[PDB]
C-alpha cells in the first residue's frame, strides 16, 4: 500500500471515489485503492463528511505544522477488533513481569539494529555494550527506557563519525526546535517513521494507546514510538547518512527562522521522497517488516512464539 | 447556582458550522450566530454535526492537548484527531482488564448484569399482568453460581423461560415465539426480536464509543475473539424496554405482519423501515425512573448504566 504526501495549500473533500484538494491554481486528484495513509504538510481545509470517508476507507491522516513539527493524527475507527487480544495487550501492560518482557525485548532487538548498523558500515560500536549490559541488570522499565535513550545518544555519536561536513553534525540531541542541521533531518525523520508504524498499527488489531517500553498513560500514542525504535537505523540513520554523504541535502534546506532550525519544503519533498522511496526496499518491504513485528507482537500477547524462553 | 461538577468537560457540539480558533479560545460560526467554546476547562470535544475546520485550528486544539471525537448522522463514532500529546483520557481499558482477569471483580460486574436483566424481565412481565414467579428460581441461582461461565447459561435459560411468557401476550400464534433459543427457530418472531437485539447491540455500541470505556472487553460474556463484548452485556437490561416492548406492540397492532417477511426468512425492507423508525422512536421514549425521581430517555438510561460501569472501575461508587 502507498503513502500519500501534500504540501500544497487546498481544500480537501471527496469528489466521487478519490480525494480532492483544491488549491488556488487547480484540482490535484488523488486515488484512495491503495492508500494506507496521508501526512498533510500544507495548510488545508476540510470537513466532517471528508473525515467519514477516509474512516470509510480506513486511511489514517497525520498533520504537520509549516515548521515541520507532528502536531497529531485523525485516527479512524477501529475496523480489527478483537476482544481477546485487546484484552491480552492490557493484561501484559498490567502485569510488571509481562511488561519488563515485551519492554526488554524492545530494547534488545534497538541494541543489535543499532550495532549491525554500525558493523555494516565498517564502524567500531564497541561501547553500547556497557549499555546493554546495564539493560539487562535493571529491575524495571522505567530504569529500561532511559537506558535505551543513553544507549541511543552514544550511538547517535559514533554516528557522526562518519560525516565529514562538520556543522551537519549532530552534536547533542535537541529539541523541541532543532538547533542545528543534524538534529532537524533526525527529528524529521523519526516523526514520519512515528506516523508510518502508527499507520501500520491501524493495519492490526493492536490499540496504539497501550505502548510497553513508553509507559501507557493516556496522553499519546506509546505502541508506535516503542515500535519506532527498531527500525531507526534502518529508516532514519541510513537516510540521514545516505543524505548528507551525497550532498543532496545543503544549507539551502534550512530556514533560520523560529529561534533553531526548521526542514523548508524543499529538503521536505527531497527527504519524502527518500524516506519513502527507503520504505519500499526489499530483500518483503521494510514497511512490511514493521509489520511483520508487529505481528509477532500479537503472536506473543496469545501465546505463540514467546519472546525469550518459557519460565 | 445549584449544582457544581468536579473534573474537566466534555463539550457536545451539536450544530453545523465552521470550527474556528480567533482568540485563545475557539469558536462554532454557524450561520446567524457564533457560538463560543472556552478551551479551559476542557478535555475533548465531540462534533456530531457537519463541521468546517482547517489545520491551524488542529494545530490550536493540539496545542492545547485536547482531542476532538468526530461521529456521523446516527451518532456512530468514525475516527478521532489525537494531538500529538493530549489531556489525560480517561481510558478505561487497563481499568477493564483487571477487572477482567481478576474473577472475584469480573463476578462482580457479571452478577450486576444479571440481577439488574432480572429485574427488568420481572417487571416487564408484571406490568403486563404476567405471572413473573417462574424466573425466582433463576434469580436464586445466578446467586448461587461462583462461576461467570455458569452465570451466562443461568441467564440465556431465564430469557429462554421469559420468552414462553412473552408469549401469553401474543394473540396470533403465527407471530409466538415459540422456543428462543442461542440458535433460533426460523419464524416471524424470532426474525423481529434478532432484528431488534441486533440494533440495541449497535445503540449500546455507539454510546459505549461516547464514553471511557473499550467495547471489546467484557463481563458476563467470555472476552474471546468476537469483535464487541461489553456492548451484549449492557444490552441485556434493555432487551424487555426496548425490543420486547416493540415486538409485542407491532405485532399485535398489526403495524408488522406477514405481509412484511420473505423466505429467501427474512424481514423486507419495507417491515425493516417501520421497525426501525419505532425503534428510533423507543429510544427516545421516557419512563419513570424513581431512584432521580424523573423521567429519562431509554438511550440516557443506557447511558447512565455505562457511566454507572465507568464509576464501579474507577472504585468511586462501587457496585
Redesign the interface.
Known sequence: MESVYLFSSGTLKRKANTICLETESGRKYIPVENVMDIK?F????????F??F??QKRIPIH?F?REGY????????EYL???????KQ??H??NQEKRMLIAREIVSRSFQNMVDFLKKRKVRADSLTRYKKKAEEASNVSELMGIEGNAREEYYSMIDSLVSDERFRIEKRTRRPPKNFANTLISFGNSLLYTTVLSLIYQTHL?P??GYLHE??????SLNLDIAELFKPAVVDRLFLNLVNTRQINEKHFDEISEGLMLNDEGKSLFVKNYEQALRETVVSMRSLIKMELHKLEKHLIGEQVFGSEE
Open positions: 498533510v500544507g495548510e488545508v481545509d476540510l470537513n466532517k463528511r473525515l467519514e477516509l474512516s498533520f505544522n507532528y502536531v497529531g493524527t485523525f485516527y479512524p475507527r477488533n478483537s476482544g481477546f487480544l485487546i484484552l492490557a493484561e501492560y498490567i490499540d494507546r497501550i501507557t498513560n493516556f496522553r499519546r500514542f
